[PDB]
Amino acid sequence: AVQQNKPTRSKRGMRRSHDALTAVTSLSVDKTSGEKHLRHHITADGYYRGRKVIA
Amino acid sequence: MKRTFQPSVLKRNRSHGFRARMATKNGRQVLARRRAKGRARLTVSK
Amino acid sequence: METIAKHRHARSSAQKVRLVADLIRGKKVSQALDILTYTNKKAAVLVKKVLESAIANAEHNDGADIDDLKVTKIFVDEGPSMKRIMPRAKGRADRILKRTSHITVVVSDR
Amino acid sequence: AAKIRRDDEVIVLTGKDKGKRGKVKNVLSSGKVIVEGINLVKKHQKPVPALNQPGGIVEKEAAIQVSNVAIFNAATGKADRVGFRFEDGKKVRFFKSNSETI
RNA sequence: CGAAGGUGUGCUGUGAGGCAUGCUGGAGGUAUCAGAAGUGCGAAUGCUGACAUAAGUAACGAUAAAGCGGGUGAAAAGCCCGCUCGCCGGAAGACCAAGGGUUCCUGUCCAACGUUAAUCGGGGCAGGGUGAGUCGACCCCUAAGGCGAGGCCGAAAGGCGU
RNA sequence: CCCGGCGAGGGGAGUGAAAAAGAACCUGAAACCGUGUACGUACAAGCAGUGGGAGCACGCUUAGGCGUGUGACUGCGUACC
């Protein structure tokens, strides 16, 4: 099955109106090192909730 | 599945080579036509 | 003062890069860098490199200050396409397009 | 034969250096000459570790069309044209303003 | 002191059209009256090039299968080292002839090629590698068949044969 | 000189009458794809225009007007060969 008429750029835009991305609301700050990280994740230096975990 | 081209150098040369073309009056006509057109390769022989 | 930076003949589709470009239009530079660091997309790396180049140009060639900069303009345009051949069934061949884009970022202090 | 030759004294007829004087350094087969101190350009030269040569911006002469120079006549202080004639058994050049051998 | 061409604006004739001028361009244009035509395009499932739609949709090629630690690196699910697991074994192992022709080994690079990433490759670039009295070819001998001095036959070209 | 992987790509300085003359290089049309501004659109039914017509924004102004963009509501109206 295939189209009988060619769709328009207006309809292309209307269909695409649900494709936008969402950004992270906010980041968290560790209490000992001061770094920013994703909530419930460890930092890039190896801290989580104030304690060093990975050397 | 088996296809149509099955190579063999001896058979190629005995069928379309320079000496085979020279052995007959029509082969010489093929060679004259190809020289008149100005081809870079005249027969199949290396 | 406005400062420009560009990436031309980038290997990606304009439609795909615009999704990431739309996240940082009109923000402060620090906020924008934080946003880009946590987007799981391939276009984010390219856009981030271009933004960093623009900031360095504003510091070195125009005597600007980092704390006062904002992303005043950003856009993506289409580039040339490379053409390739892909075989299909029953001896029929199709055409493949490999699309590219140009990326432009403008930072300003006003 | 040729009317302009190496080691001559010439004056410039056209271009930005119109009016200056100099000497001919060498003659090229395309119809151009290199005159000393005339038609200078600034070249951006890249360094090369081999040959022990650094880079920089250099000034050097560029070739100029031969029909844009004239042979200088010190007696009159003016530009001139050249002609050819046989004197003893040899060809020679001579000035056309006063018919004097060069 | 700005030609043709490209792009806006103002005026003008019943129409096909005409005139003036701002920006772009960087060296050509042509009155009037006459003369000659490859002289005007929306259609021919017309011819050649460029670009859309479906759509960021189908698919990424045998259901033999992977886990973890260290190394290098701008970056490692796929490269290198180590331990464990799984699959073939009259083959999915080892070797010749035919066919191909540098794909072989070492160093260096990641644009394009590899249906994904690639630090990796049968990819790019440069250098190296094939040593015979006894292995093969050439050489001596003939099969089916081919060519064939003189010869027989056929308008020519040619056919069959010692 | 600077950002970047001793990348690709870019910003300055310098050359030249000119670099939107930078090697993918004279001029640079159209289809097709974007960024910014003004106005319209989430109770409304069809070849998408034509006649009538509020309101909003903007330039003149001889303060009397006019021009230019958009166009709610309403009569008529089923492409071309």
From Swiss-Prot, chain A:
Disulfide bonds: none annotated. Residues 1-37 are annotated as: Disordered. GO terms for cellular component: cytoplasm; cytosol; cytosolic large ribosomal subunit. One of its GO terms (biological process) is response to reactive oxygen species. GO terms for molecular function: structural constituent of ribosome. The keyword Ribosomal protein applies. SUPFAM superfamilies: Zn-binding ribosomal proteins. Keywords: Ribonucleoprotein, Ribosomal protein. The keyword GTP-binding does not apply. It holds the Pfam family Ribosomal_L32p. Part of the 50S ribosomal subunit. Contacts L17. Belongs to the bacterial ribosomal protein bL32 family. PANTHER family: 50S RIBOSOMAL PROTEIN L32, LARGE RIBOSOMAL SUBUNIT PROTEIN BL32. This is Large ribosomal subunit protein bL32. It comes from Escherichia coli (strain K12). The lineage of its organism: Bacteria, Pseudomonadati, Pseudomonadota, Gammaproteobacteria, Enterobacterales.
UniProtKB/Swiss-Prot annotation, chain B:
InterPro entries: Ribosomal_bL34, Ribosomal_bL34_CS. One of its GO terms (cellular component) is cytosolic large ribosomal subunit. Coiled coil: none annotated. One of its GO terms (molecular function) is structural constituent of ribosome. It holds the Pfam family Ribosomal_L34. The keyword Calcium does not apply. The keyword Ribonucleoprotein applies. Transmembrane segments: none annotated. Gene3D superfamilies: 1.10.287.3980. Belongs to the bacterial ribosomal protein bL34 family. NCBIfam families: rpmH_bact. This is Large ribosomal subunit protein bL34. The lineage of its organism: Bacteria, Pseudomonadati, Pseudomonadota, Gammaproteobacteria, Enterobacterales. The gene is rpmH.
From Swiss-Prot, chain C:
The keyword Ribonucleoprotein applies. GO terms for biological process: assembly of large subunit precursor of preribosome; cytoplasmic translation; cytosolic ribosome assembly; response to antibiotic; ribosome assembly; translation. Keywords: Antibiotic resistance, Ribonucleoprotein, Ribosomal protein, RNA-binding, rRNA-binding. Pfam families: Ribosomal_L22. GO terms for cellular component: cytoplasm; cytosol; cytosolic large ribosomal subunit; large ribosomal subunit. Changing residue 91 to A/D/S: Abolishes translation elongation arrest of SecM. Signal peptide: none annotated. L-tryptophan binds at residue 90. GO terms for molecular function: large ribosomal subunit rRNA binding; structural constituent of ribosome. Belongs to the universal ribosomal protein uL22 family. This is Large ribosomal subunit protein uL22. It comes from Escherichia coli (strain K12).
UniProtKB/Swiss-Prot annotation, chain D:
GO terms for molecular function: large ribosomal subunit rRNA binding; structural constituent of ribosome. One of its GO terms (cellular component) is cytosolic large ribosomal subunit. SMART domains: KOW (SM00739). Keywords: Ribonucleoprotein, Ribosomal protein, RNA-binding, rRNA-binding. Transmembrane segments: none annotated. GO terms for biological process: cytoplasmic translation; ribosomal large subunit assembly; translation. Pfam families: KOW, ribosomal_L24. The keyword Ribonucleoprotein applies. The keyword Transcription does not apply. One of two assembly initiator proteins, it binds directly to the 5'-end of the 23S rRNA, where it nucleates assembly of the 50S subunit. It is not thought to be involved in the functions of the mature 50S subunit in vitro. NCBIfam families: rplX_bact (TIGR01079). HAMAP family: Ribosomal_uL24_B (MF_01326_B). Belongs to the universal ribosomal protein uL24 family. Part of the 50S ribosomal subunit. Might contact the SecYEG translocation complex when it is docked with the ribosome. This is Large ribosomal subunit protein uL24. It comes from Escherichia coli (strain K12). The lineage of its organism: Bacteria, Pseudomonadati, Pseudomonadota, Gammaproteobacteria, Enterobacterales.
